[PDB]
Design a binder for this molecule. Structure first.
Ligand SMILES: Nc1ncnc2c1ncn2[C@@H]1O[C@H](COP(=O)(O)OP(=O)(O)O)[C@@H](O)[C@H]1O
Ligand SMILES: [Zn+2]
Ligand SMILES: [Zn+2]
Lengths: 76, 245, 474, 59, 73, 76
């Protein structure tokens, strides 16, 4: 399913993945295409602390959704 | 010297004046120079100087709009002076004439003014008129307000505010104030008396300081009703350029 | 300047000026004419028509309407003048330099620079019409201050102005928050050094402007407890008694003179500050009703040249004496009798202040409308200068108040806790946050569409340091 | 209560003393009432006093 | 030594005290000067409680510093 | 390397020290110019409870870096 992910700065990328798919899959995909481990990644939607243990269906996400990614960097 | 003869300009630009090479040499002018031109009724304008040898020595060419603004006719004399201290217009607010804009759809600014001012650097002064010929239409406008005042150069970055209600044309004509002495006839004696009694105290106050006297202040006109007393007062006030109240 | 003055003022003034406010009227049964053509009763009613106001129980005429009346009364177009500014703030101070042949006032005066007799009269136009409190908590906390301590209070009220449809060309001041300056309150009165107050308020108002607020009045409580079982308070301010004693009137006049309202229709450019003063006294019953007032323009220009002082009579203001640098002409106050004739009475020893006031209508926003409150807050982090009570801003209260919310997430809950006026002021005072970081903080806390800005804020290292030190601190 | 005439800032500024002096106001070598004449009561900038005697409504 | 304190009234008061004493000494000094016993007095420095079981040396109070006083029954 | 150091009260000082230098060096300099034993000295930055045993390059602190100072007793 088409969706949009915007990082903290504002850089945006379009992803395709099923709503039933677990968000952990999207986090692993983001890691693969950005080398960012999921621990540093944190995805938010409407002020919800989305975690790798849930799927977008539980959060009730739909297509072209805007997901805000934040880097809990591991450099400190 | 600077008493250049008025003539009809070939170009339709509203801020371009063509001058003779000999006069340009006399006044040390050059092509592209912005100069302040004064005609009649104390009217002033800013014109871009262009060398033109076709005109006879001591003659200049200006278009219809500039002459209308200056309230002068072809064949008259205009005084041209340097205007080197003209700054770029920070913000110009301009409104069109209603009758001209009738039957126009879309944003008038983009249609007419946007190509007119971009890469043009046309000087603009308050109370002036400029006409834009776009497509099959020709529309006149007014220099309603200029920042910095009272005049400035409209640069590429200059902001233009075209928003505002249409301006009726009837106001300019039917309110024909600024009437000069040419609108009063048959009373030259009294007109001369009022002029010699008003202009000199105001236009040349230093005279009385040199002679060390207090000029007379009060004046009282009287006569049969309908003899143009108000008209004479208005004409004298407008010609003197004082703050009429 | 060959026309009206050129200057930029508040947006409310501009939008009000654009309107004309005419109240249409339909064919009256007394008309004698065809459908088209209106004779005398079908004409639109001007916005300044006093009959309509007094018929609708409105005691004053919505200043902008007064400006329209003045403009219509004169200033014919295309001729008749070169524009005369219709509004001029009266000045009573003697011209220090007139010199028709005489020397300055201390040892010489003529009849051209002698302040003429002043005719006090109730003003007819009130600048600001409706003072509106966004939420009951904003003033409930203020009164809770008195409840806890028992002493009086005093605090400025920041807010913004807007239209007011309920009155012809009326204005309303919506107050958003209340800031309490350092003052020494007491049973019968309150005191505060002016220097500290102004020095603090300069920076506080700078920060508020950065936030988009503005100082729009002062509010103080004059409350006493009754002998009833519950909490009841006497009504010491009614028709018979004094609505506002001399001293509060003087202070309000000074405040107005120091908060001028910029206007385009005066030679100086200012006229009749849009400053509103609210007092809490209690209605005829035991309630804690509030009120609003505003001293007229003459009183605004009267206190500047001294000429007034408090009197042991609460309802009357003493008049000073002539002396060098202060010339006080005879003051006649004009009233109306029961026979419809105006009477001028000389009152040198003392005169009532009822002629130096205009009353506004307080109220609260309709409880069935859209909510545009800047701050969903004011029940939380204790307000600034409540040292006298136990409330005290410091790290420990921040730890107790705004730690668990941030340490986990739930940004929806966080936003409201971050949109508290005093919280923002305190965190800015700490100076931990960087300037731009604080700017985006306030933009997130006082504006909608805040998700991205809030996420960026929690991203910035400043907030990380803030939360880290807060957690580490006890 | 006592503060309705005799409280803080009522003793600091002897409102009773000023009232009695105004009543018997002469160089000449306790209750307060509002039938008499006023007397100047000036206080510096920034001071408020709410201790004037109450009068209650008209009933 | 010379320190400045913001009292309940809101003004500023300067007090003198040796910086090698328990804070209770400062509390006693202020209460004696004004008459507000130290049982309810609490002192805040840079937004931090100053417990009476420590002196000023450990906190390393800088000269010409600022304290704030609050009451709590 | 030029860096800002701000104390609890608000005082800030500009110091110079190599990034490779151990943070113990900067804490010792603070002790020298303030007479504050390092145990009372807790240097913080970007939500990092810096310890005396580290060096700036570990924390990646570079020039024009502002670091805050707190105490470990109970807070500032
Ligand atoms: N040279 C002139 N002498 C007299 N009247 C003139 C002259 N030129 C025009 N008029 C006309 O005569 C009238 C003069 O009006 P005037 O008598 O000045 O008015 P007022 O009653 O205010 O004095 C106007 O209608 C004007 O247009
Ligand atoms: Zn009719
Ligand atoms: Zn004089």
């Amino acid at each position: 399913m088409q969706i949009f992910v915007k990082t903290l700065t504002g850089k945006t990328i379009t992803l395709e993945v099923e709503s039933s798919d677990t968000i952990d899959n999207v986090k692993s995909k983001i890691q693969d295409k950005e080398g960012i481990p999921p621990d540093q990644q944190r995805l938010i939607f409407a002020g919800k602390q989305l975690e790798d243990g849930r799927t977008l269906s539980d959060y009730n996400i739909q297509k072209e959704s805007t997901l805000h990614l934040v880097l809990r960097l591991r450099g400190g | 010297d600077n008493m250049l003869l008025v003539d009809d300009a070939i170009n339709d630009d509203n801020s371009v004046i063509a001058i003779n090479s000999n006069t340009m040499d006399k006044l040390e002018l050059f092509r592209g120079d912005t100069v302040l031109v004064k005609g009649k009724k104390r009217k002033d304008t800013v014109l871009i100087v262009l060398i033109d040898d076709e005109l006879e020595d001591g003659a200049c060419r200006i278009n219809r709009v500039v002459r209308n603004n200056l309230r002068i006719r072809l064949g008259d004399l205009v005084t041209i002076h340097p205007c080197p201290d003209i700054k770029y217009a920070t913000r110009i607010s301009v409104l069109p004439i209603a009758d001209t804009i009738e039957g126009i759809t879309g944003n008038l600014f983009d249609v007419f003014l946007k190509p007119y001012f971009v890469e043009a650097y046309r000087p603009v002064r308050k109370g002036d008129h400029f006409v834009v010929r776009g497509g099959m239409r020709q529309v006149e406008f007014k220099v309603v307000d200029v920042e910095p005042e009272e005049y400035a150069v409209v640069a590429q970055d200059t902001i233009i505010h075209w928003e505002g209600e249409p301006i009726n044309r009837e106001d300019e004509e039917n309110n024909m104030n600024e009437v000069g002495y040419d609108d009063i006839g048959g009373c030259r004696k009294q007109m001369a008396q009022i002029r010699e009694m008003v202009e000199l105290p105001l236009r040349h106050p230093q005279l009385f300081k040199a002679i060390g006297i207090k000029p007379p202040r009060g004046v009282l006109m009287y006569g049969p009703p309908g003899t143009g007393k108000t008209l004479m007062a208005r004409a004298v006030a407008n010609e003197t350029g004082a703050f009429f109240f | 300047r060959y026309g009206p003055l050129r200057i930029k003022e508040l947006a409310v003034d501009e939008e009000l000026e654009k309107e004309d406010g005419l109240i249409p009227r339909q064919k009256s049964k007394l008309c004698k004419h065809g459908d088209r053509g209106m004779c005398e009763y079908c004409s639109p009613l001007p916005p300044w028509d006093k009959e309509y106001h007094e018929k609708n129980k409105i005691k004053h005429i919505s200043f902008h309407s007064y400006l329209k009346k003045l403009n219509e009364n004169a200033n014919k177009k295309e001729n008749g003048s070169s524009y005369i500014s219709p509004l001029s703030e009266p000045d009573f101070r003697i011209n220090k330099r007139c010199h028709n042949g005489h020397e300055p006032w201390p040892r010489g005066i003529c009849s051209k620079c002698q302040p003429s007799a002043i005719t006090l009269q109730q003003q007819e136009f009130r600048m600001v019409d409706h003072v509106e409190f966004q939420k009951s908590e904003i003033i409930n906390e203020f009164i809770q201050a008195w409840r806890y301590t028992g002493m009086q209070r005093f605090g400025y009220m920041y807010g913004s102005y807007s239209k007011y449809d309920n009155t012809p060309l009326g204005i309303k001041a919506v107050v958003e928050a209340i800031y309490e300056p350092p003052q020494h309150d007491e049973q019968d009165g309150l005191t505060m050094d002016v220097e500290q107050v102004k020095n603090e308020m300069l920076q506080i108002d700078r920060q508020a402007q950065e936030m988009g607020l503005s100082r729009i009045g002062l509010i103080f409580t004059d409350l006493s407890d009754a002998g009833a079982g519950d909490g009841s308070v006497f009504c010491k301010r009614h028709k018979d008694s004094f609505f506002l004693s001399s001293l509060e009137v003087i202070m309000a006049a000074r405040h107005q003179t120091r908060h001028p309202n910029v206007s385009k229709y005066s030679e100086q450019g200012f006229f009749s500050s849009k400053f509103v003063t609210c007092v809490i006294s209690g209605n005829l019953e035991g309630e804690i009703d509030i009120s609003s007032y505003q001293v007229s323009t003459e009183a605004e220009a009267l206190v500047t040249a001294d000429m007034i002082s408090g009197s042991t009579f609460p309802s009357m203001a003493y008049i000073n004496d002539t002396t060098d640098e202060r010339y006080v002409p005879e003051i006649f106050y004009m009233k109306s009798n029961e026979y419809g004739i105006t009477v001028k009475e000389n009152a040198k020893p003392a005169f009532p202040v009822d002629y130096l006031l205009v009353t506004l209508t307080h109220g609260f926003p309709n409880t069935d409308t859209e909510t545009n409150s800047k701050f969903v807050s004011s029940t939380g982090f204790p307000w600034s200068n409540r040292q006298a009570m136990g409330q005290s801003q410091d790290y420990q209260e921040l730890k107790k108040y705004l730690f668990n919310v941030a340490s986990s997430g739930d940004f929806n809950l966080l936003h409201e806790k971050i949109s508290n006026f005093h919280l923002l002021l305190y965190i800015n005072s700490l100076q931990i946050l960087s300037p731009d970081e604080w700017k985006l903080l306030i933009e997130s806390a006082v504006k909608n569409e805040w998700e991205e800005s809030l996420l960026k804020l929690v991203s910035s290292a400043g907030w990380q340091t803030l939360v880290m030190i807060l957690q580490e601190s006890g | 209560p006592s503060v309705l005439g005799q409280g803080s800032m009522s003793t600091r500024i002897d409102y009773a003393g000023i009232a009695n002096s105004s009543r018997n106001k002469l160089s000449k070598f306790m209750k307060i009432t509002f039938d008499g004449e006023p007397a100047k009561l000036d206080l510096p900038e920034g001071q408020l006093f709410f201790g004037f005697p109450m009068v209650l409504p008209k009933e």
